[PDB]
Amino acid sequence: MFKEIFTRLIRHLPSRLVHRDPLPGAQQTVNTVVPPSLSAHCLKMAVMPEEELWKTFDTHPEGLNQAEVESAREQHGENKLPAQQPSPWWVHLWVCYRNPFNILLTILGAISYATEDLFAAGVIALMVAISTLLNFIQEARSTKAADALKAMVSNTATVLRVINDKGENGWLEIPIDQLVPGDIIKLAAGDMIPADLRILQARDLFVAQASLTGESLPVEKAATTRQPEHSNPLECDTLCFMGTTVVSGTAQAMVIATGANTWFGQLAGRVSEQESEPNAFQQGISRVSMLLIRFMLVMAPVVLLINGYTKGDWWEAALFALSVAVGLTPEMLPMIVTSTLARGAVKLSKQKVIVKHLDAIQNFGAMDILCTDKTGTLTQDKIVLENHTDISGKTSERVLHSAWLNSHYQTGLKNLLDTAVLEGTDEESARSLASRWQKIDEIPFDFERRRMSVVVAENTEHHQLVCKGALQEILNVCSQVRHNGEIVPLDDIMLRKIKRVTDTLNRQGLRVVAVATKYLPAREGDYQRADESDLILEGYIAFLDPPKETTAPALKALKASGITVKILTGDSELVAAKVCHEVGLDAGEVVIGSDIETLSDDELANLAQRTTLFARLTPMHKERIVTLLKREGHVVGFMGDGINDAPALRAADIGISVDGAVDIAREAADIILLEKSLMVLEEGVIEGRRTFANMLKYIKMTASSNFGNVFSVLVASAFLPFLPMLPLHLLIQNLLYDVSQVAIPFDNVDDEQIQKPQRWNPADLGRFMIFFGPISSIFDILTFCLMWWVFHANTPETQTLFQSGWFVVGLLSQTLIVHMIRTRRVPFIQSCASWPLMIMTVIVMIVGIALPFSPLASYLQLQALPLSYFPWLVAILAGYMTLTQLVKGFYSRRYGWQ
Amino acid sequence: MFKEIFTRLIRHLPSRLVHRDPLPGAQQTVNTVVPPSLSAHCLKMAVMPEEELWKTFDTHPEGLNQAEVESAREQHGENKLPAQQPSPWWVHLWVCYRNPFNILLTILGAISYATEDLFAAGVIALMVAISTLLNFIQEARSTKAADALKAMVSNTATVLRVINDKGENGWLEIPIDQLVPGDIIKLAAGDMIPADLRILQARDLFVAQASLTGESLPVEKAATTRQPEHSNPLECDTLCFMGTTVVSGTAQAMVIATGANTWFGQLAGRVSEQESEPNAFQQGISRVSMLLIRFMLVMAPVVLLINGYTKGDWWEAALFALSVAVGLTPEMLPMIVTSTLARGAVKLSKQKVIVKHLDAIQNFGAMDILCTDKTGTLTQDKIVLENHTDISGKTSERVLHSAWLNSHYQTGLKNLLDTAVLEGTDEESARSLASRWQKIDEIPFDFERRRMSVVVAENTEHHQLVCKGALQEILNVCSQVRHNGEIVPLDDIMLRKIKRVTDTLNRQGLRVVAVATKYLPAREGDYQRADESDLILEGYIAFLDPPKETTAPALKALKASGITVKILTGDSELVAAKVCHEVGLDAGEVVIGSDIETLSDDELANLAQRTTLFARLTPMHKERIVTLLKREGHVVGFMGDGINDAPALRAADIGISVDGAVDIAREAADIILLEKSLMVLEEGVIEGRRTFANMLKYIKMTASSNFGNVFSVLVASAFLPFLPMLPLHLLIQNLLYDVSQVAIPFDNVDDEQIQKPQRWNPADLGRFMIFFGPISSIFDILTFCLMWWVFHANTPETQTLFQSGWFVVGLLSQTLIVHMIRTRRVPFIQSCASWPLMIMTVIVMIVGIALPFSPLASYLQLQALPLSYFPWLVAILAGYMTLTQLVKGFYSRRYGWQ
Ligand SMILES: Nc1ncnc2c1ncn2[C@@H]1O[C@H](COP(=O)(O)OP(=O)(O)OP(=O)(O)O)[C@@H](O)[C@H]1O
Ligand SMILES: Nc1ncnc2c1ncn2[C@@H]1O[C@H](COP(=O)(O)OP(=O)(O)OP(=O)(O)O)[C@@H](O)[C@H]1O
Ligand SMILES: [Mg+2]
Ligand SMILES: [Mg+2]
Numbered sequence A, B: 001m002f003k004e005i006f007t008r009l010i011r012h013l014p015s016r017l018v019h020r021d022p023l024p025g026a027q028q029t030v031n032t033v034v035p036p037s038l039s040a041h042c043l044k045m046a047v048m049p050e051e052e053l054w055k056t057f058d059t060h061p062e063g064l065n066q067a068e069v070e071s072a073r074e075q076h077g078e079n080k081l082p083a084q085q086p087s088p089w090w091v092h093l094w095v096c097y098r099n100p101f102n103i104l105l106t107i108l109g110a111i112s113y114a115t116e117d118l119f120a121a122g123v124i125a126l127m128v129a130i131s132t133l134l135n136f137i138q139e140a141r142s143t144k145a146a147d148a149l150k151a152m153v154s155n156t157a158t159v160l161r162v163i164n165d166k167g168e169n170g171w172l173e174i175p176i177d178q179l180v181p182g183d184i185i186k187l188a189a190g191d192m193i194p195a196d197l198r199i200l201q202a203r204d205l206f207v208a209q210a211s212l213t214g215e216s217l218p219v220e221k222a223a224t225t226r227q228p229e230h231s232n233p234l235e236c237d238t239l240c241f242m243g244t245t246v247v248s249g250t251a252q253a254m255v256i257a258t259g260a261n262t263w264f265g266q267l268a269g270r271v272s273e274q275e276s277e278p279n280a281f282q283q284g285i286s287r288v289s290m291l292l293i294r295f296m297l298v299m300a301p302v303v304l305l306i307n308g309y310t311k312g313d314w315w316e317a318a319l320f321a322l323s324v325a326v327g328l329t330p331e332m333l334p335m336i337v338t339s340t341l342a343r344g345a346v347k348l349s350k351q352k353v354i355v356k357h358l359d360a361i362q363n364f365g366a367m368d369i370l371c372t373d374k375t376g377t378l379t380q381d382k383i384v385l386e387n388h389t390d391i392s393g394k395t396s397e398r399v400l401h402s403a404w405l406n407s408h409y410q411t412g413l414k415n416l417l418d419t420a421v422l423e424g425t426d427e428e429s430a431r432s433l434a435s436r437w438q439k440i441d442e443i444p445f446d447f448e449r450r451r452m453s454v455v456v457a458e459n460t461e462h463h464q465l466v467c468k469g470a471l472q473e474i475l476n477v478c479s480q481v482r483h484n485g486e487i488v489p490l491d492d493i494m495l496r497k498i499k500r501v502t503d504t505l506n507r508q509g510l511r512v513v514a515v516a517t518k519y520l521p522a523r524e525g526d527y528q529r530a531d532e533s534d535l536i537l538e539g540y541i542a543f544l545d546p547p548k549e550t551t552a553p554a555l556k557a558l559k560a561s562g563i564t565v566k567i568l569t570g571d572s573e574l575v576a577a578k579v580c581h582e583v584g585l586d587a588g589e590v591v592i593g594s595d596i597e598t599l600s601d602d603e604l605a606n607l608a609q610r611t612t613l614f615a616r617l618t619p620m621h622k623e624r625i626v627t628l629l630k631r632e633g634h635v636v637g638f639m640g641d642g643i644n645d646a647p648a649l650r651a652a653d654i655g656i657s658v659d660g661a662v663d664i665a666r667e668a669a670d671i672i673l674l675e676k677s678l679m680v681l682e683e684g685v686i687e688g689r690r691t692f693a694n695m696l697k698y699i700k701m702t703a704s705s706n707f708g709n710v711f712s713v714l715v716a717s718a719f720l721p722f723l724p725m726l727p728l729h730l731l732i733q734n735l736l737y738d739v740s741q742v743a744i745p746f747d748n749v750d751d752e753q754i755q756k757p758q759r760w761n762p763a764d765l766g767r768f769m770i771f772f773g774p775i776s777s778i779f780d781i782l783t784f785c786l787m788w789w790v791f792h793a794n795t796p797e798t799q800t801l802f803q804s805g806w807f808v809v810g811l812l813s814q815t816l817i818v819h820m821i822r823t824r825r826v827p828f829i830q831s832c833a834s835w836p837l838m839i840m841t842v843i844v845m846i847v848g849i850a851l852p853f854s855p856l857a858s859y860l861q862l863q864a865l866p867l868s869y870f871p872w873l874v875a876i877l878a879g880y881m882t883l884t885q886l887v888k889g890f891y892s893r894r895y896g897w898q
């Protein structure tokens, strides 16, 4: 325990490949007051006139040429966090070369084989150099390939710039990282704010400043200040901050700060600390490395003492001990992780399952609860039927026109209703209505009201207040009904008639949306929420969106694989239960969102496991239920692409999203699907499990044989009067084994280890490496005895034959046990291996067997081999390969292979 | 030269692999003289009592043991046409060995090389044997693989038999070719009759005998005859014949005749005559062979005369002539065709595009018009909404039960409406209705009436006549309307109201189905079509089946590839036009099927090219329009799976069907999709186009080089005083080239030759072989000159050096030209080749190079080679390989590569 050196002998993968990005835009709204310097700077930056910003920076409303932009970027920096910047390649090569084991091995080789055998020191240096070069090349290629997927789904911003020749403007799109202070961008509806901005012109813009303050309701933004005093940096009504979204309207602005110099960085303390959080993966890797280093430190010094006490060459004994123990170095773990996860990431990218950071694969194949939504996931989102009826039940042709205006003079996100309404009316009426009315104002949508209104006028006499929304949210405010072509007061029986007729319209999959209007005199101020009072109800619009064809087979496959699907919707409870019944899902009993509001954590944690359907949920309920569903040991995934599902994605253990959605919903995600569906997800889960199934095998088959070799050396070398194998032979054996192992990430996995949500136990290695280690030791000692007695050996004068024989038999045994302990079934007749692995094994086997009979054998302190040794070698190899097949039965009976 | 009959040097592929099965069940009802013996036997069969058929055969109503069935099958035969039986493998080996070219070559080798060297004759025999053995193995393996896909979609039949051999009945399903005479089978609705039957018990069975008589109406089938006199073999009312389906009811019969001893065999004359029909493929395969044989007889005798006049060994000259000319043999075509089509068929089988006979691939990648049907191809075929309303527009709750009774007492094919109605009622009401009523009779469905009726009684006092069908086909009969709870007479305005309300229900995608009942007193006879008079209308049912999600991308992909899609529906003309608009397909103007009935052939031919939609079509219109769309030369495909689209699938140039359909629809089809969709078809069309490209390449890149070698020999053998290459070397060259070419049907085809509905022209082989042939003769004569002058040769005592050099350079030039005349782009940087082809090329190259420097070289009359010809070999090879790249430009600009 403790041993601060043990934390320095373990290298770490970069924090961009294994850790979730710490900056979603908001993260945690800490109570850090921060020095008043930044607040004063922001307040100063929010008061200068338009002309001052012209000269403070080099901004020009015609674009920035390709020369000034580079100079300004180099002067200031880049729009990236400090932790997201890759390291230089030469530093990467250097850090992979100063490993303590490698440096000690080189120093000890220089000490021992110098005064008489300088060539041995040279070849030792060559071997360590080639090993570290192989590791560096593999890791560098994998980490370069893994960063191409991160930039393929990056957010974009619309800058003006210059594109073609000169002053051509262009309004081209660039990634948010290629941003420079003093640059002008344009904001539209549903768009993340890249960095701190300064609005120049406005068109009734609204932003959701809830990620920083918690006001929930959107806050209006304008170019020239309208409030008398700001007194705060977050309410200046003139700037913008990253992490927020644009809810309504369009505007233009110019950036004033980028990188870590903005808000949410040093102001929120995101860079300061907040990094001492290992996310499971970083704990398992550390535990595995600690186990390996503990076993190495246990094994090495006993062998050192034995070889230093039997003979008198202490330096040689220490070097031999280090050479034997080098096979269990923790330095191999980064290669094992990166070179295997990168290939899985590329294969997933081939199936439109783009993965942002490599760690997501571990949680993507180990989950057992999927929390999705209704629209898009189950339904087509394209409606094929709609009836713009009236209050009595007749086609009106007035409700449709009163709903066209509300869906043509609004700048919010378009729905599945607005497109249908725009495509429903004929061209002539649309043109006439467009020519007859002019937009005046707009009240944007916000939750807890569920209602959107727009104010339109025809002439300079009066104004209209057309309105839509859910049926209950207009029926709760309206006061009159236009019945039989005349305005009549709304009494109580008419309220009990609509709630029956429209409830009958439900239970069939039809959604109901009401429409209300109001005549209002000529005003000059700005409207607000409270203006929507005492309107006249006109009618409703009932429409149907059918279920997607590829829904039932996806659910059957997900149930077969062990994943349980739960629906967290925010629609009505009568609908979303018929939809769940048309696709075969067992809705059972539903739970509304009002009951959850008065339940304790213990009650909810046990209620939420037998529901399968929650209706009428606010986002807070979603975020609470997602958190509570992870109670016992489960892994919970949330799939959603709305504008308000920012905390839910981070709260769950995975953040599955969809490409082509709101920017904030993609900035907080982990896996970005390229096509919203459920069959793609199902086919990607299988590959996610399969890729991670190779890593465990690649670790186990490498650790077990090395431990067996170390144990054999410890047991046998005591009686032997000389070193069984010279260290150079061990080094070249390890190098050849590492070369042969490269083809493992391209293996075949049986269809029995993946049809279950798999859980990773790092302590299984310490048992699998003890049960499968001495099996090689028995045959190694048998080969020692056979070469000693049959072939007239154990002569201090002549010993190269013994070392050559053990080298050959050891390489054969090490390389040929891979094909037998990779499966639970009988090999080569039920579960074979992939062709590249066989090809690499054969090539390495030929190279190893042909090395002693080569001109270079004498240079490497090795000699030839008699032709009578081959049958005994084959017999020993076949016996060792056969024995493990019979032994394998007892291991799984104890705790389980996987 | 003609002499088509004299040309018996053309072996033919079996008729079961390239020709459509001549027995679709009815074929053509030609007026052939009926054999009196067969008619007498048929009339005699259907008069015996129940007990006589017990002893006429060995049938027992408990099954047939696994011994009696085998003996009876061996005594009578098998339920298969004589043309669909495989040949013994030893006969296959023999027919591949008696090839006239091979026999003449062997005889001439025996004549020439026997009095001075028997070893030469021995090795000649060995070479020809190994060649014919390779061809036999390839063809046999491919034709064995190809017949596994033909029995995977074979029609089944429910026989009783014994499963445990101790007595358990079983009712197991077997293919219709394992049927033994004297066996009992059970018939259900929608089941083609396997063979001639004998009905034992009946449950109001109906069979559509419209494939042998043309009545077009179902004919009732009984168990004990009720008609007084038969007087005809096709109206006995007790027997069944193959080719006819079961429309309604269930029954149990016993087979009497199987195989070619049935009706439709010697009666319809299917086996006798009507065999001389080449289906395009059999014409191109003949013309290509004719061209090859014409060139061979043009080239051989001139070379024979030259080598017999220059030298004096006439036998050697003739043997050399045949050895040079053996490359252009027509015997290699069957291997080229089968071994390349079988792999494509297997790959299609891997994508659920199962192909019945191998010729369908040629017409599956060359079609430019696709004719399909609305339901199932565009809609999901399951309804998500339905309204069992009343005449005035209210939920009647009475029209539903009057529909449940009809949908619960029918025996015909189930529809999308019946499943919903059976699922659209609560369990209690269903149980009450089932326990209250009883079934009496049933009038089946038939076209030209478009309705179904069932007679149901509750107490023995009266009955009911609940009827279903189209709105116009029921409103044309009914006389009263149950309105406001009282039966009111129907008048004219009530007819102009329904046809407006229900036409407003259309234009939205809703289908309308009416319901009518009638109160009828107690009867004892059988009802007919005319009893449906003066019914009381109750209401209609409007439902909606939504479009399938994967429809628009499929249509976009099909339009990209050039496959124009046309709709031939049999539904209303108001619906099926909104459905086409929802999926994005253009409709324009709609053509009703009544207008087509009064149009000539030319007007219909020039009209059906710009319609894209046909509404309200009877099957005769479907067949006529399908026939008349092949006017210009286009290829027309029909997709359909109904009970009446039997002649349409055969009239079209390709019978695309769907697995799981009616048996008659599958028995008259070429491709059986395993999943109804428009994306599986699209992904299979590309593979179909791609396999034919590989076939064309494999044909083209073989004959041109051989013609080049023949021309080179003809040019250069005059002045040369001895044979440039001994015949054994040429034979081994051809053998090694064939071994290298084995891997061609695994190649990569560029995505430029398959983006158009390609079509085949056999005359292009007589041009590509003349343009690219002599391009190898210049380098061949240059190599001759270089070896003669630079290497001090053409001494009539030492000549093996010349033969060795030319053999090596010729093998190199033949094998290395493949990789550049296989694409139009620049090779190895824009379009590479598949790895197996490269591996085979490398292996063959190594074997060819190492052969002269081998101990066996002296046995084959071939010596070593000095280490100075290698640079000249490499230089000339590179020059020849790089000249054709520049030459390739002028070829495509003349008539086109493909
Ligand atoms: N632009 C909008 N933003 C938010 N809510 C909207 C908007 N337009 C309509 N609504 C209504 O507000 C409620 C919020 O539904 P929302 O789209 O957030 O649901 P969800 O959680 O994504 O799931 P699903 O829509 O599949 O049931 C619904 O009643 C919806 O009809
Ligand atoms: N069992 C039935 N057999 C045949 N036609 C039926 C049957 N039941 C109802 N019909 C009606 O008879 C007509 C024949 O339609 P059919 O199923 O043959 O069309 P189709 O050519 O396959 O094309 P579509 O996709 O429009 O259905 C339709 O009006 C259909 O509603
Ligand atoms: Mg406003
Ligand atoms: Mg949503």
Ligand SMILES: [Mg+2]
Pocket: A155, A156, A191, A192, A662, A663
């Ligand atoms: Mg965006």
Ligand SMILES: [Mg+2]
Pocket: A705, A708, A709, A776, A780, A810, A813, A814
């Ligand atoms: Mg070992």
Ligand SMILES: [Mg+2]
Pocket: B204, B441, B442, B443, B526, B527
């Ligand atoms: Mg009847």
Ligand SMILES: [Mg+2]
Pocket: B373, B375, B641, B642
């Ligand atoms: Mg049909």
Ligand SMILES: [Mg+2]
Pocket: B155, B156, B190, B191, B662, B663
């Ligand atoms: Mg069948």
Ligand SMILES: [Mg+2]
Pocket: B705, B708, B709, B776, B780, B810, B813, B814
């Ligand atoms: Mg040649």
